[PDB]
């Protein structure tokens, strides 16, 4: 996260770290959506341009974290993956459309002060909150600038951007399964996700029921925190039928 701040303790108890076993590195962010399901970006797991095609055994889920590198004994919980499910129509070739995956954990994770799921939006949530100017929150242990890594979880609040602005910022074809967020150059504030924040959550606090909803998944950006560029997020609500399908079947 560029131009964010250190998370408060327990601020994002749905934050998950995808941790590569060998080498030991941060693979991506993710989110906890129940006691056995973790949501992330497909491209965290499968991105043949960059000979990424992790399997379940390659990664751990680390939940309850704050420190990036430290083993937070009695706080984090480390979970093994039972199975990864990548959206079958994930478009890694063109534009990361449907950049979403689910991971089932071998065992349910115990909730604690530090570990707790985020909600997924329903249509009404989406339709209320996913409005240009409405800010969400992105969190991650990714780089602090494009070109360095944080001691702890970083947080940044970023406004959703009007779709034509998103589209005009890039040559890539933006789909209805994406939205973008970030400040405009005129806007003076900054912030973005950056390498290793992929797969983590863009969340919004519903003013109707005071719950956090994960509205987006950190997907991609052209660099980090560049003027006139925006972060692109998977539209969770648009893909929730697939989510529900997977969770319902498996």
């Amino acid at each position: 996260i560029v131009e964010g701040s250190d998370a408060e303790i327990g601020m994002s108890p749905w934050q998950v770290m995808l941790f590569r076993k060998s080498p030991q590195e941060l693979l991506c962010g993710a989110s906890l959506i129940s006691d056995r399901w973790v949501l992330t970006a497909a491209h965290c797991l499968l991105y043949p341009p960059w000979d990424k095609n992790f399997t379940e055994n390659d990664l751990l889920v680390r939940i309850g974290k704050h420190s990036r590198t430290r083993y937070e004994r009695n706080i984090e919980k480390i979970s093994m993956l039972e199975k990864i499910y990548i959206h079958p129509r994930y478009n890694w070739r063109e534009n990361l459309d449907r950049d979403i995956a689910l991971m089932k954990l071998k065992k349910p994770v115990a909730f604690s002060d530090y570990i707790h799921p985020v909600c997924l939006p329903d249509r009404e949530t989406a339709a209320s909150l996913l409005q240009a100017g409405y800010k969400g929150r992105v969190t991650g242990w990714g780089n602090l600038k494009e070109t360095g890594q944080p001691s702890v979880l970083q947080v940044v609040n970023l406004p959703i951007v009007e779709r034509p602005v998103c589209k005009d910022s890039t040559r890539i074809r933006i789909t209805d399964n994406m939205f973008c967020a970030g400040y405009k150059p005129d806007e003076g504030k900054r912030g973005d996700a950056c390498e290793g924040d992929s797969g983590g959550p863009f969340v919004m606090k519903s003013p109707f029921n005071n719950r956090w909803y994960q509205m987006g998944i950190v997907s991609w950006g052209e660099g980090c925190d560049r003027d006139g560029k925006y972060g692109f997020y998977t539209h969770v609500f648009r893909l929730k039928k697939w989510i529900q399908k997977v969770i319902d079947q498996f």
């Binding site: 941790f19 030991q24 590195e25 751990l60 590198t69 430290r70 083993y71 480390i78 093994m80």
Partner: peptide, 11 residues
């Protein structure tokens, strides 16, 4: 060398 070793049971 960045990350503190995980308890061996998780690997």
């Amino acid at each position: 060398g960045d990350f503190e070793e995980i308890p061996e049971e998780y690997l």
